[PDB]
């Protein structure tokens, strides 16, 4: 079962603040029009592949990250169990973390883990009708920078009529974000998708002639 | 604040298992560094040793091990000798401060200290910051005599030995490599 993510999955790649300029960055992004798997038993343990785009429409409680999930390796079970969210990496405790909870809507997350750091983005745009993944462009803001660095290559979702959640895999492709006046991202073109859309990355605009 | 422990610690790690005690989130005054009679080599690379109080730098790593006399000059960026080929590599862009002082009152027994080993042979040529803690056999020569361990194959770890009658070239020098990037 495949669904087509239209243009979603763009986060702020940096921590600086720009304004009204067309920035060109090179990082791990979700490709445009990439095949994303519908998961309508429900939770097979899936690989990591240096970054996955989780996106589900409170039935979802969280995710479990690790290598094989026993008492041998350290796990990472990101669970929103209490009125506030907790994060446990124990199996023997090395780290814990409590913050404001992460919890129709459209919950999106872009997980990535590179060089000892665990990064996690978020968004909470609302949607009523089920275009499965909507067409609108919205950015993602990072929640926490987690310097734990457990080698993670497997992830499995905690849970509790069938529910839906999508997972699409990241790749090293470069984008071209359009920053707005205020400082938000409102559009982005891909520099590897279409032979039209390559020319918007080597002419540094959104209009060609 | 956070690195009075990494310098004055009773024992130090050996070259294959280099410590990587990581410090963050307190002020590092550096006033007990670069003016001290105990130190012997303070050769910072890409950053001057002066003007280090007035900067603010993040994710500063503090490596540690012990090496002998004529091996301090292999912790430079580059200079492929013996312990930089297989044991400890400092990447070419470094931004750091190798601090190689002298310790012969602490790290020498009556019959020689043997707690500071190193890796003489290794099949693999290393990557920067790549620990190679595994102790598998080296197979010197194209020879399938694997399990015998007599010759044409070597157990890679080997001990230093530190007797206090030895010369300046082979006394142990407790280096400390403060590494930091932006």
């Amino acid at each position, epitope marked *: 079962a495949y669904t087509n993510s239209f243009t979603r999955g763009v986060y702020y790649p940096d921590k600086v603040f720009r304004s009204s300029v067309l920035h060109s960055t090179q990082d791990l992004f979700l490709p445009f029009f990439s095949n994303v798997t519908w998961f309508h038993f429900d939770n097979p343990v899936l690989p990591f592949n240096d970054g996955v785009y989780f996106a589900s429409t409170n039935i979802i409680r969280g995710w479990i990250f690790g290598t094989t999930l026993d008492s041998k390796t350290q796990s990472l079970l990101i669970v929103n169990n209490a009125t506030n969210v907790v994060i446990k990496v124990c199996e023997n405790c090395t780290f814990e973390y409590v913050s404001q909870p992460f919890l129709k809507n459209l919950r999106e997350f872009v997980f990535k883990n590179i060089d000892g750091y665990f990064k996690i983005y978020s968004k909470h745009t609302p949607i009523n009708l089920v275009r499965d993944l909507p067409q609108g462009f919205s950015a993602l803001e990072p929640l926490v920078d987690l*310097p734990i660095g*457990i080698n993670i290559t497997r992830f499995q979702t905690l849970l509790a009529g069938a529910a839906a959640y999508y997972v699409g895999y990241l790749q090293p492709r470069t984008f071209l974000l359009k920053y707005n006046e205020n400082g938000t991202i409102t559009d982005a073109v891909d520099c590897a998708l279409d032979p039209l859309s390559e020319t918007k990355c080597t002419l540094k605009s959104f209009t060609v002639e | 604040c956070p690195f009075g422990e990494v310098f004055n610690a009773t024992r*130090f*790690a050996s070259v294959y298992a280099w410590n990587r005690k990581r410090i963050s989130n307190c002020v590092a005054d550096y006033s007990v560094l670069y003016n001290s009679a105990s130190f012997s080599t303070f050769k910072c690379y890409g950053v001057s040793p002066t003007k280090l109080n007035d900067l603010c730098f993040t994710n500063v790593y503090a490596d540690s091990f012990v090496i002998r006399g004529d091996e301090v000059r292999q912790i430079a960026p580059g200079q492929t000798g013996k312990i930089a080929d297989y044991n400890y590599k400092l990447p070419d862009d470094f931004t750091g401060c190798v601090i190689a002082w002298n310790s012969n009152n602490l790290d020498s027994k009556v019959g020689g200290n043997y707690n500071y080993l190193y890796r003489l042979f290794r099949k693999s040529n290393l990557k920067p910051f790549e620990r190679d*803690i595994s*102790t598998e*056999i080296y197979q010197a020569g194209s020879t399938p005599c694997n399990g015998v*361990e007599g010759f044409n194959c070597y157990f890679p*770890l080997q001990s230093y030995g530190f007797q206090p009658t030895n010369g300046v070239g082979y006394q142990p020098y407790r280096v400390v490599v403060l590494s930091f990037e932006l």
Partner: nanobody, 124 residues
């Protein structure tokens, strides 16, 4: 963190013993280097090795096919078996333990330790 040996004494040749290196203290993996044999007035040689995560039996040629090691993760210990004792193997043996106190992935605080000494005097 200390180390404890056992299996020592004076025993006739062609008999048997069992060498055991016992650990204690606070650690996380205790990856073994192995047993080390030092002849009197000589250098110690790597008589037993290959006890890591992925490993293979490393025995020197002088005791090849005669002595065996075993990975005992109950106390994080090791057992060296003695078969067909011979006065060439007369040595003060050492066990070599790489302790590690590094619960994180990055800050690899890991000193290097050795044992005490086993009096193995055999003769025909």
């Amino acid at each position: 963190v200390q180390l404890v040996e056992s299996g020592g004494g004076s025993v006739q040749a062609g008999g048997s013993l069992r060498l055991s290196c016992a650990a204690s203290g606070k650690f996380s993996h205790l990856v073994f280097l192995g047993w080390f044999r030092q002849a009197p007035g000589k250098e110690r040689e790597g008589v037993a090795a290959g006890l890591g995560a992925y490993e293979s039996g490393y025995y020197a040629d002088s005791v090849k096919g005669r002595f065996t090691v075993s990975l005992d993760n109950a106390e994080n210990t090791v057992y060296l078996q003695m078969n067909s004792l011979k006065p060439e193997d007369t040595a003060l043996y050492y066990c070599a333990a790489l302790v590690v106190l590094s619960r994180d992935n990055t800050e690899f605080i890991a000193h290097n330790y050795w044992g005490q000494g086993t009096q193995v005097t055999v003769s025909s």
